[PDB]
Amino acid sequence: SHMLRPVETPTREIKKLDGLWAFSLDRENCGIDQRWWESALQESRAIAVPGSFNDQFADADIRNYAGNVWYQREVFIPKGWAGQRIVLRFDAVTHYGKVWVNNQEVMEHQGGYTPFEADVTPYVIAGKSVRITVCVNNELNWQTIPPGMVITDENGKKKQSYFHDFFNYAGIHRSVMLYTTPNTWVDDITVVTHVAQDCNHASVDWQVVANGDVSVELRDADQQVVATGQGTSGTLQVVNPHLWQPGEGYLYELCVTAKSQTECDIYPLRVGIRSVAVKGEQFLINHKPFYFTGFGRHEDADLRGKGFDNVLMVHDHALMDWIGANSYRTSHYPYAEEMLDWADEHGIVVIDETAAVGFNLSLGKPKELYSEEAVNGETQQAHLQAIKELIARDKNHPSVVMWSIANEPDTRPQGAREYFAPLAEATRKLDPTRPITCVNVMFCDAHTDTISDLFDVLCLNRYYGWYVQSGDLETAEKVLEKELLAWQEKLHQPIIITEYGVDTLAGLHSMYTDMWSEEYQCAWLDMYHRVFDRVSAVVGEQVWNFADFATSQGILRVGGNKKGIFTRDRKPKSAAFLLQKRWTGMNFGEKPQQGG
Amino acid sequence: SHMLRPVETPTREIKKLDGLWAFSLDRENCGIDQRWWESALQESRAIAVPGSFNDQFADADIRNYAGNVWYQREVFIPKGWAGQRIVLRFDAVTHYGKVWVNNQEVMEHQGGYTPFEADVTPYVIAGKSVRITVCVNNELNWQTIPPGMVITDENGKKKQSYFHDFFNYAGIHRSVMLYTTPNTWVDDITVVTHVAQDCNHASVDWQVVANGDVSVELRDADQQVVATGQGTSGTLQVVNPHLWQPGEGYLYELCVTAKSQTECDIYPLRVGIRSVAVKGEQFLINHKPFYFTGFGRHEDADLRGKGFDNVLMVHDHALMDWIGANSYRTSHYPYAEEMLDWADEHGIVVIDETAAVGFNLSLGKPKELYSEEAVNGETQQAHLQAIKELIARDKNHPSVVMWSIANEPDTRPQGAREYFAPLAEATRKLDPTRPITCVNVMFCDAHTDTISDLFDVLCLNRYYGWYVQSGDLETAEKVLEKELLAWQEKLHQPIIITEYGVDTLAGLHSMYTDMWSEEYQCAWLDMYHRVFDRVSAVVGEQVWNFADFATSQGILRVGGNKKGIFTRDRKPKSAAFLLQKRWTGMNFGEKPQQGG
Ligand SMILES: O=C(O)[C@H]1NC(=O)[C@H](O)[C@@H](O)[C@@H]1O
Ligand SMILES: O=C(O)[C@H]1NC(=O)[C@H](O)[C@@H](O)[C@@H]1O
Numbered sequence A, B: 001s002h003m004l005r006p007v008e009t010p011t012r013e014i015k016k017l018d019g020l021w022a023f024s025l026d027r028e029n030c031g032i033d034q035r036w037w038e039s040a041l042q043e044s045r046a047i048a049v050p051g052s053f054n055d056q057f058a059d060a061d062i063r064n065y066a067g068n069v070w071y072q073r074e075v076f077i078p079k080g081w082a083g084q085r086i087v088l089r090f091d092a093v094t095h096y097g098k099v100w101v102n103n104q105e106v107m108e109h110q111g112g113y114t115p116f117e118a119d120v121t122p123y124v125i126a127g128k129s130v131r132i133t134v135c136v137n138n139e140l141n142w143q144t145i146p147p148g149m150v151i152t153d154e155n156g157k158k159k160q161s162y163f164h165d166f167f168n169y170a171g172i173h174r175s176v177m178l179y180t181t182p183n184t185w186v187d188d189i190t191v192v193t194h195v196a197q198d199c200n201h202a203s204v205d206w207q208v209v210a211n212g213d214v215s216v217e218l219r220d221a222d223q224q225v226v227a228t229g230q231g232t233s234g235t236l237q238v239v240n241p242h243l244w245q246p247g248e249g250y251l252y253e254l255c256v257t258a259k260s261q262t263e264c265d266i267y268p269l270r271v272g273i274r275s276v277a278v279k280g281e282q283f284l285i286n287h288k289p290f291y292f293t294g295f296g297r298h299e300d301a302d303l304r305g306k307g308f309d310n311v312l313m314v315h316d317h318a319l320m321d322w323i324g325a326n327s328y329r330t331s332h333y334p335y336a337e338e339m340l341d342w343a344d345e346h347g348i349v350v351i352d353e354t355a356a357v358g359f360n361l362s363l364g365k366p367k368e369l370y371s372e373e374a375v376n377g378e379t380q381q382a383h384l385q386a387i388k389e390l391i392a393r394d395k396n397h398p399s400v401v402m403w404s405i406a407n408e409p410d411t412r413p414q415g416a417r418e419y420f421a422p423l424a425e426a427t428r429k430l431d432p433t434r435p436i437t438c439v440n441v442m443f444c445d446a447h448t449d450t451i452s453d454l455f456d457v458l459c460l461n462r463y464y465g466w467y468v469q470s471g472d473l474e475t476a477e478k479v480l481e482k483e484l485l486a487w488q489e490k491l492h493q494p495i496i497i498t499e500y501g502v503d504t505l506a507g508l509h510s511m512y513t514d515m516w517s518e519e520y521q522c523a524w525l526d527m528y529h530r531v532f533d534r535v536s537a538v539v540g541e542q543v544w545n546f547a548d549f550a551t552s553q554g555i556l557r558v559g560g561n562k563k564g565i566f567t568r569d570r571k572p573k574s575a576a577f578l579l580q581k582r583w584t585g586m587n588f589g590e591k592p593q594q595g596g
Helices: A311-325 A339-345 A376-395 A416-428 A473-491 A519-535 A575-585 B310-323 B336-345 B377-394 B416-430 B472-490 B518-532 B575-585
Strands: A021-025 A045-047 A068-076 A085-090 A094-103 A106-109 A114-118 A129-137 A148-152 A159-161 A177-182 A185-193 A201-210 A213-219 A225-230 A234-239 A254-260 A264-271 A274-277 A282-285 A292-298 A327-330 A349-353 A400-407 A438-439 A458-460 A497-501 A538-543 B013-015 B020-025 B047-048 B068-076 B084-088 B096-101 B105-110 B115-118 B128-138 B148-152 B158-162 B176-183 B185-193 B203-212 B225-227 B252-260 B262-272 B275-278 B280-286 B293-299 B327-330 B349-353 B400-407 B434-441 B458-461 B493-501 B537-539
Touching: A045 B310, A085 A094, A085 A106, A094 B013, A106 A114, A106 B400, A148 B518, A185 A254, A185 A264, A201 A254, A234 B148, A264 A339, A264 A416, A274 B349, A282 A538, A292 A311, A292 A497, A292 A575, A311 A339, A311 A575, A311 B047, A327 A538, A339 A349, A339 A376, A349 B493, A376 A416, A438 A458, A473 A497, A473 A519, A473 B203, A519 A538, B084 B096, B084 B105, B084 B400, B105 B115, B105 B275, B115 B416, B185 B252, B185 B262, B203 B252, B280 B537, B293 B310, B310 B336, B310 B575, B336 B349, B336 B377, B377 B400, B377 B416, B400 B416, B416 B434, B434 B458, B472 B493, B518 B575
Parallel strands: A292 A327, A292 A538, A327 A349, A349 A400, A400 A438, A458 A497, A497 A538, B293 B327, B327 B349, B349 B400, B400 B434, B458 B493, B493 B537
Antiparallel strands: A021 A045, A021 A068, A068 A129, A085 A114, A085 A177, A094 A106, A094 A129, A148 A159, A185 A201, A201 A234, A213 A225, A213 A254, A254 A264, A274 A282, B013 B176, B020 B047, B020 B068, B068 B128, B084 B115, B084 B176, B096 B105, B096 B128, B148 B158, B185 B203, B252 B262, B275 B280
16 A cells, blocks of 8 residues: 555654553464454563564563464553544554454454554544454564464474574564545645755655645755745756765755645655666766765664664764764665664665565575465565555665665576566666665675676675685685675675674674674774775675674574674673774765775 | 552553754753743754753763753644643653743752652643743762762863762663543552462552542452452452462563542552561561572663663673572662662563762762762651652562662761661661662771661672772672671571672683683682572672773773673673573572582
8 A cells, every 4th residue: 555654744643552462472373263352462561662572571482483473452442533534553563463443354464564544434433442462473474574484293283494694573663553545635745855066956856646736845954944835746947056965964845735625634754855767887876976984774672673763863873973983774674764764864865674584594494485385476465565565665764875685695596587587676766866786605605696787786795704714814805895896896786784793792802803702893894995995896894793682592693693893781892992993083975094 | 748659551651752852952051041941942953752861972072061951842732631630741751851832830859869750731732832841950968868069160061979889870771651541530559468388378459549449359460350349448358379489480460440530540450469578587578588680780881871761771680590590779860760670570580779879979079978968867858758659660670679769878987877767767768678888989888887787688789899898809708708607696687799899801811810801700700609608698689780880980980880780782701601500590489508
């Protein structure tokens, strides 16, 4: 469908992101048979929402649970809600959610990281209390996005195995809410912003107003109307603009009005006037070459598996700001929209990424990745859908300068191309206004990768000197430089190293500057930087990883992934100061001149 | 002011605690002078509420700030709230708040741990946006609770000094809510439980109807009316008992119905039928011997400081339950009421405490602690006032067994007894239903301590082996026993050890089992246990602290305070398993055989 972001004015929100909900596991999978949504959840403990369910109770068995869990909550419809359009929305429900308003199934969703909502007007009475039961599923398979394989052992007990390097946290990770609109309501806006050598431009609009004529006005930061439009559908605005720019992100405001004969609806959409374009080996923003700095991030913290939190967001952005990061990539799933609102407001450049990681069977059972058994026509449709829902969500955020379709598919087999070519094309139809990318795994190098020509920007995840040439900066450096030059000459695209990093145990110090030591982390990033500055095609550097985060258990992960610049409690490792010096020492948004 | 916990029936609330407010420091103390409240705060930045302002920005200069900070936020008033009573409520604003609604000063408060509310109907228009501005002050002085001294440097800036161990986190710590009520409504209730030998017994209501009559029906957990009164001012209700017990904590519900010609206000309260009193050396729960287990705790966590957080609350309770805690004390300030509903609902026992800590000058410039210079009549009032507001809030929470009037005052100076006798008086009258205490410091020991006799239960914070007899279990054991026995003689009052603990560095291990080693914590906690058991008078153990927590900087505090059984990120130290084993190897609410 269509997704607008709930704002208040004529339209109003009840939070119900009030956190305390009833919660129980459904170990027997009785829940649907017995219609638990029909009465109060039995044997139910208190849980916080928004939040992962896994870590809230410090219990291994709830953490490692695979299958169905139930959230239940009673809530009060505002009396004043009367005959307005009432909508129940979930910003996210991890992997799968099915929702009941009082023994009435109102919605269903597969996707752990984007919103789903249903008009509930007919199913609720204003001034009365309703029971809300969500059945949440955390299972992955070959058609889920990201993919996985549940293994049931001989006892019929499920266990989730998956192919990506973060932990499969689940639950209601983001805001759930009740919200209002008039029976005439704006429900889709699409803004495209053009700029022409930065003295003037046009901002096209496209508007869907469920039964309403629309009018448009564009306002300053200091709230004065600078352009108007009728053409309630397709209306183009000309301006002497304050451009939304990486440093500051100046935001205009577009007010969308849906008028019925008796009814009004008012939707304000923040707009940054900026162009994004690749020209040759450059990534241009408002027609200037940009240089990315900053991180691949995760949504991860102690006690919240991936649950959204405002303090964590305020804090992490103070860190990213302090360190001189100008960008990030929503590694491995769409992030909370609050994050993109922040980025828009603060002029943070973002690479927006679907949840399509784990397409790889060689990261470290089926023998063909592209297979009817394993990655197939159904998967591709699920993949396209994931792309659709992400673009439908994030299309108007000026902070998003690029779409990332997938992280680290195995592109060696013939068929990778078969599978990805249509997604690349589809994606571009969905959004013509942004470069497109597919993040690239180390072993699909310049000579073996089959897919990268189909996208606009080259985003490489590189670990030379870590997973390969381990401990050896000297030969690490040679392989890295040779690889990046090969890519440059092969594709003549802008290259962003979207991942480079080494596990570092905070407090592990070594005179020998060897693996897993603060000093090795320092020397290794430093060597990588030396190379980047020698390669003109390199247009960006995003360190892996903002902070330590949880993964599945194994021999390769010491209590988790330790490639953070900060620890999970947001303590700086000495590499944090190193990056601070490089990033705050550069000219903003500008690439070093390959010397101090 | 009259104080009721807002809840949703015919009554509605919108949390403005939706987190992102605009924030600013007023370093130049211009804020009040320039009516900053009249316009958008400039030089503003985003901050999350509910949370301490100190640690959200990873900035030392903000963390150590003393003076006024400004919080601002705009909020659309809901359309269905139009001739209703609207109340603006802050559950806590740490130290001091001054609130404006569009250039209309609406409220002021001293005390960082209790709610304050005002009707804003006249200053706000329904369906319109109003601007909310708050002035938050963190400064402490002799009149304040807890006290402090603020020094203005030779350069001109302010630095805070204070005498309690934990860190001075300030800002809007708990939720802010807009709040609805009919023009005729309830703003007060009080309930008492009598239970004689667990046969059927009574609950006396006393209520305040702001212009209405009340029907007052008591419902069982099944909403089955088991008693009724119409005397809106004084009643009694009697049925086969069904005790609120510490094991499971069963609750009843009391609908408070308040009637006017046009409007009815239904207010709901939760009631736990239980009895608390001392007979000689025993704390009796429903006329039966209780033995406390669990912790002294703080409100402290990684990036929010003392800011409330549901996930943290869910998680901490999981851990206390797991470890066998049945009780805790709201250390050195009153906690978020959410914590008390949890304890009410899960049947946890709570020693409730005021913010009155740091009366002492010997813990580690004025000559006389109780004097015009230090602690005076004015200070005794605020102490009184703080005690008023606490009981006003928590009087109805069944989980509260006892008031702690203060933590660790120095009672050796002249006038200590004069100071505490009248406050003891005023409190006994304010709640006759619950016993009353004052938590005692090591150096005011049995022979030296005045003012132990005015309280019903002896609450002792003891550190032998750690501050004295440093590292010496053998002598510390004797001093402790002789001490505890010397306490049974002077008084035959129930003894609870409210604090016993040792700093311990997670990961510090020693074959020598010496100070600041995981082993020592175990050995020492073990030692207090052997002694504890031998003393018939000892009614309880509350370990200091539950988890590591921040303190102001100094040579005695390494991370901050390290006496936590868990680290600040909630990871167990080996002593978590020691306590686990004792506290679950017990019979519930009972004392060990002074042997196995
Ligand atoms: O193994 C790593 O340290 C990282 N490398 C990668 O190439 C992946 O894109 C990341 O998910 C992963 O966390
Ligand atoms: O110094 C301590 O280990 C603790 N002992 C005490 O007696 C105080 O009550 C606490 O605030 C303090 O943190």
